Design a protein around this motif. Sequence first.
Motif, short mmCIF file in Angstrom:
data_model
loop_
_atom_site.label_atom_id
_atom_site.label_comp_id
_atom_site.label_asym_id
_atom_site.label_seq_id
_atom_site.Cartn_x
_atom_site.Cartn_y
_atom_site.Cartn_z
N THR A 87 0.65 -1.26 0.11
CA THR A 87 0.12 -0.07 -0.04
C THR A 87 0.69 1.47 -0.02
O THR A 87 0.48 2.29 -0.60
N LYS A 144 2.58 1.59 -3.52
CA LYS A 144 1.87 1.81 -4.69
C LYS A 144 0.40 1.69 -4.02
O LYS A 144 -0.50 0.87 -4.11
N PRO A 145 0.08 3.17 -3.83
CA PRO A 145 -1.38 3.17 -3.07
C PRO A 145 -2.31 3.16 -4.22
O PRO A 145 -2.20 3.27 -5.24
N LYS A 146 -3.38 2.82 -3.71
CA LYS A 146 -4.79 2.36 -4.86
C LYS A 146 -5.67 3.83 -4.65
O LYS A 146 -5.20 4.76 -4.02
N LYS A 147 -6.61 3.70 -5.38
CA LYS A 147 -7.82 4.61 -5.33
C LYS A 147 -8.23 5.19 -3.87
O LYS A 147 -8.70 4.29 -3.11
N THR A 160 -10.74 6.86 -1.11
CA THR A 160 -12.19 6.48 -0.71
C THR A 160 -12.53 7.96 -0.17
O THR A 160 -12.03 8.44 0.70
N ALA A 192 0.53 8.49 -3.02
CA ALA A 192 -0.43 9.20 -3.57
C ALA A 192 -0.73 10.46 -4.46
O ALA A 192 -1.06 10.64 -5.56
N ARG A 244 0.47 9.45 -7.80
CA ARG A 244 -0.48 8.64 -8.54
C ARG A 244 -1.20 9.71 -9.40
O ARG A 244 -1.78 9.46 -10.35
#
Lengths: 79, 204, 62, 190, 87, 137, 108, 174
Positions: A3, A6-9, A11, B57, B60
């Motif tokens: 995480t 490479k963080p995700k989308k 919320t 992030a 990203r």
Amino acid sequence: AGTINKPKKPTSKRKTTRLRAKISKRAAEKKRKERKLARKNPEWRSKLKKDPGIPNLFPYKERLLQQREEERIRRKEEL
Amino acid sequence: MSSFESVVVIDGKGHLLGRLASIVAKQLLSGQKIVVVRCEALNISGEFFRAKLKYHAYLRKMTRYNPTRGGPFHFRAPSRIFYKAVRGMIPHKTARGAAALERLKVFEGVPPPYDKKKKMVVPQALRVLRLQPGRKYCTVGRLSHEVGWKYQDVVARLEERRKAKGAAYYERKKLAARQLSEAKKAAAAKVDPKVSEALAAYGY
Amino acid sequence: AKSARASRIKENHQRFKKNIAGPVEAARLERLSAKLMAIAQASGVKSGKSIGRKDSSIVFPM
Amino acid sequence: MRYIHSEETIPVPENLKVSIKSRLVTVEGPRGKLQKDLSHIAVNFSVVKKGVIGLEIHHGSRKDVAALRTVRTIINNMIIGVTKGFKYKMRYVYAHFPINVNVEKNAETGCYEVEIRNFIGEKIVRKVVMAPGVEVEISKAQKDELILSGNSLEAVSQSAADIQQICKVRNKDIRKFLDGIYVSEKGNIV
Amino acid sequence: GSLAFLPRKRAARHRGRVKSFPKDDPKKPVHLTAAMGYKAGMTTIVRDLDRPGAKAHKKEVVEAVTIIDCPPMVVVGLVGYIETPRG
Amino acid sequence: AEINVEATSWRRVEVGRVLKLENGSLAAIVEIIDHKRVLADGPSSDPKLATPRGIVPLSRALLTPIVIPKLPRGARTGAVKKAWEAYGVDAKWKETNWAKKQLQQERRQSLTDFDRFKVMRLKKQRRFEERKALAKI
Amino acid sequence: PSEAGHRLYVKGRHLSYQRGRRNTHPKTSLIKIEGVDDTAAANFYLGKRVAYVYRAQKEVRGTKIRVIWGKITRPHGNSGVVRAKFTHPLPARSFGASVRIMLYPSSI
Amino acid sequence: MGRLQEYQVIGRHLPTEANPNPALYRMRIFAPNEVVAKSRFWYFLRGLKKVKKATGEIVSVNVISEKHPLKVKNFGIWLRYDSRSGTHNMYKEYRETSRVAAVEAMYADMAARHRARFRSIHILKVVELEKTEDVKRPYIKQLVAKNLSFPLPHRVPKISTKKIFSAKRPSTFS
RNA sequence: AACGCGACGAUACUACCCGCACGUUGUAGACGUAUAAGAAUAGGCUCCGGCCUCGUAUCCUAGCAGGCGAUUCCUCCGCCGGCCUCGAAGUGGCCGUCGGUAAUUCGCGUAUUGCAAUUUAGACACGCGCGGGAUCAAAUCCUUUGCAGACGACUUAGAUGUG
């Protein structure tokens, strides 16, 4: 999990007006349904409730309890 | 004491990023010239993996069609990170905000123009005065180096050189202060009994 | 197959660089440096030893 | 619950000297010198008697006092290392391919290099570098055994674990192939 | 194609620039890194191959080579660079 | 066994320690209530140093290096006063450096405008003497 | 050789107008006086004169210096910032700018 | 909550021909002011007995203050608080100078630790522990420990909030 | 990065550099715009006596917006040279000369701006003037070339030469 690297989308915590209205409406509906079910109430209800009483850690439980007892004795003898 | 100065230099070591940026932005909009040094020595509360997650992030987030124009330019330097905080706190899309940002300057390390100048501190943003002792913190310089800042070693070597020169200057300061103390007592007799007691009565 | 960026492959390449290619390139560098070295040898203020000044800004103009 | 005071105590031998800075601990004795930084934990160091040091936490939590039990044992481990030292005896076994262990010490960087060859017939050499302050020998008291000794328990143990991890079998049956280098005995030199 | 070489664009200069010199350490002897030349063309050679493990070991292999005319270069300057936080 | 430790030397809060309040006053601790509040009393005859008996927070408090040797816990006003004059708290507070700085500050603040010129002039004379002394060395 | 300063005013900084979250009122300006920290310090300077001095392009009667005069009216908040009323509202480009606060009329 | 004082209230059912000279109920409560004191007294009397505000009157309301507000006391409070599960009992201990301070600290601590509010908390009995051996909680035990002395490490200096810039790095030792 | 930066060559005009006469020239805004250790905060500083909440501190601060003249003072300041120093976006010290200089005291002038009206007074940048030194250039178009090319653009070549 990777995480950090490479963080995700994310919320979103930004509340939409459509959601606020819907949750307020459904909260009100649940409250009214609870009230109607409590009106129905296919369950017994008593008058006196289970009083837990003085905790065992009270420093003056003995004094309070003997106070109560002498109060009962006095009330009984007077009445 | 609410004092106005021409330019104030802030030593960024041990300062919380957001709180120092708040103070700096308010001063810039009030009209005070700010020069922040040791942005790599700045600090961020929380833990380093949380800071690195936030920056990843940020990486990203990017524009699709054309990264060259309109996209979020991810600056990796600690001075640019602090500048990003200050810009987010200043209304940069106005002439007033542009003027404040022109009043702001930031550097990594302490350049030779500012090594001989006085560096002030903001107790309202200091780590040792704000954070609880058991709480974790990370370094903006470490975050920048792990995201791609290319000049950690150069700044470290320049800081070592500056500290050696400062040690030489401080030996000279020792000599000067010792001589000043000897000079005060030496003319403690040769003066005027009245003046001496007069100063003592008047608080000097 | 193992990638070109694999850690074990990188360790093997490091060992090869340290054991064979290192010595070979050092020897050739010594020879070429010797050749080029041979081809090469084929008051302070008015002398230049004292380095002085020749002939936007970082500080806010006072 | 914010305990007002919690105290711990570490005794010291006669033949040792402990010099403790802000939070640097340096211990000297017959075997050598060991230094360690404990600046990451809040503690007041004190002297209570002639040969005992004291560690205290005021207005702390259970986490804080738990640090004080770790801080003691770490300092105690350093004292024991400088008094008697630490020693790990490891043994290497094999079924068909003798494991060849070559131990040498390089003049550069002053460390001990252990080379493992013929681990279940592999042609690769496995080189492990020791932490500084660690002596490695193939003692002629038992066969197929190695002794790894030193002043720092952490360094000695990490080195032993390093050899044990580097001699690991892959893609085989654990129950069938019994080859490796394993820590057999743990103790002090004296 | 490869997004490494794309956006595709004309070279800003005809000469072509190095963009990276090998990392330098004091231990090695003093030497120059690069050089210049002019491409003349290509010719064919043959090589008594001595590559062990190959199918063409100890055999004659025809290979194509390029010729670059390299007249001696003349040294006319000396540039000194310094390290800064900006590069 | 040789041990060399230089970590800290704090000032503790206990019964009998006098502490300084931002009014500039002094009060001795009689009882420790919690880990951050104490009960204090100033029976000092000096009106500037007098403090009514009551609760003071340690956040507002400031610890002075004077400790009454055997002040009993829970001592009422009359006895704490007896200990105050027995130990001579006022003289030692005056000798301490904090009160000296406070008095220097008070003099500088109460110093008027003619007095501000006088100080300037006299410091100039002393400065001339000091520069003559410093020139030799 | 006097080698001394000639200042008789107190420095101040025009910060902004008296404004709400959205609406701004140019009638009264907010002035941060150098060295004032609290409402008592402000109460000392209530009623004192204030001048905004700027430079113009054309000299009209012997100078290019133009001045806008006003007075300190009342304290603002708890941080010593004061409200000031001028004969004309300030140019609104002089946010974060210098003003001279004069001690007259005096009461000490 | 707020600033409190002891309020002792006597109230009685309005006299009638059937039952002249009524019982004259009395109780001591904690309120910021006398109006709140009377309202809480009437609410509690409605909850306990069959006496209402309209059919009753307030004979007396007086402020009980502390006998000795200058000496440190330990207080035990037995209270009942109703949460989402039901009514629960707690005995808690406070080291203060007054029953008023004890009740203030108790409201603050219950709000901080259990999010219990004023109408969710009932004060059943507050007592002053006449001596040690009556303290059952380790924090007040360590407060009453013999020869209690402790330092105050890491004291953040109190700097003026308008002093934006300092020339020296502050110290946290004294 | 075509509104990021560095090094170097040549810079005709214009005026490139030097001194002041300055400018009814500009500036998100001079008015003492004074002040370099580093490092820790459950510790530090030191002259090694001791000291440390506290920059509410230190320096500097008097004189027609700061005149003229004396007794007395060797202290401070600035400009030029010499020796060195400073390169992270480049400076300070020592010596020397020269000019100014209340640490003490005194004298002769200030008035009238008329009871306040920014005490037009700083810095950098730019521009007109003189009188001193100095310099004496390129690029584009045109033709050509084809390592280039939708058109522009680019690599080349045109001053007596291997043109």
